[PDB]
Design a protein around this ligand. Structure first.
Ligand SMILES: [Zn+2]
Length: 255
């Protein structure tokens, strides 16, 4: 599985039948169809005590991992019930500024998309959570090309060290609060992971307001390799999946 012509998203179903399930992600968010739900509570992002450990290239993206042995970085409120712990955050981008996001807004595609992954602590470990319908909460943030995101530079600068698959590097004292937009207005629907196993255990929280990054920032992302060290170089670009059918599900808005 990958994003190539032969192992791309159109092929995942072979291996992962759930690929053509009822609550697959990503999706196109029709803003005219989204339902304003007044019963929706404000998001509660507590990341002041966040502990980042490292960054690694897993061959499909680069993940910044956090210490989730305690309620240090959590997400609550909104459409959620109980506390969700931050375990990792990563991105999805394109070969061009014209594509890269997972989710689309009225068919519009962004440069990239940030996923902050949290797991329902009632289930004890990530592993068990991914086996429940209310197992995960993923915070989705759109990235547009414009002005630099100061808070993102610490990450861009470390990319050289994890160019190939299986590389990792210590990445302590990184504050995720620097990647958040000003407003926390969101869209929410019941979905799945956007990559295999594509388990349907995610509660998506898509922020309305995108953050901007400079052309130079996103460009460094495109210098990554899907391949392992000493193998033919395959640039890590377009690690996104085509939008899926909403199939009855309803997209709710907090605004
Ligand atoms: Zn993702």
């Amino acid at each position: 599985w990958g994003y190539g012509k032969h192992n791309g998203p159109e092929h995942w179903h072979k291996d992962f039948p759930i690929a053509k399930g009822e609550r697959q992600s990503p999706v196109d968010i029709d803003t005219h169809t989204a339902k304003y739900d007044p019963s929706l509570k404000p998001l509660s992002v507590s990341y002041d005590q966040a502990t980042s450990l490292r960054i690694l290239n897993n061959g499909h993206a680069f993940n910044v991992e956090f210490d989730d042995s305690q309620d240090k970085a959590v997400l609550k409120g909104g459409p959620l019930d109980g506390t969700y712990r931050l375990i990792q955050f990563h991105f999805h981008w394109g070969s061009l500024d014209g594509q890269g996001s997972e989710h689309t807004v009225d068919k519009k595609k962004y440069a990239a998309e940030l996923h902050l992954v949290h797991w329902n602590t009632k289930y004890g470990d990530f592993g068990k959570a991914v086996q429940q319908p209310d197992g995960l909460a993923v915070l989705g943030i759109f990235l547009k090309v414009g002005s630099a995101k100061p808070g993102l530079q610490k990450v861009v600068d470390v990319l050289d060290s994890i160019k190939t698959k299986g590389k990792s590097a210590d990445f302590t004292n990184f504050d995720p609060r620097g990647l958040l937009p000003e407003s926390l207005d969101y869209w929410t629907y019941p979905g799945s992971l956007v990559t295999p196993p594509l388990l349907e255990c995610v509660t998506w929280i898509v922020l309305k307001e995108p953050i901007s990054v400079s052309s130079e920032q996103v460009l460094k992302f495109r210098k990554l390799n899907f391949n392992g060290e000493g193998e033919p170089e395959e640039l890590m670009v377009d690690n996104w999946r085509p939008a899926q059918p909403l199939k009855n599900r309803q997209i709710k808005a907090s605004f």
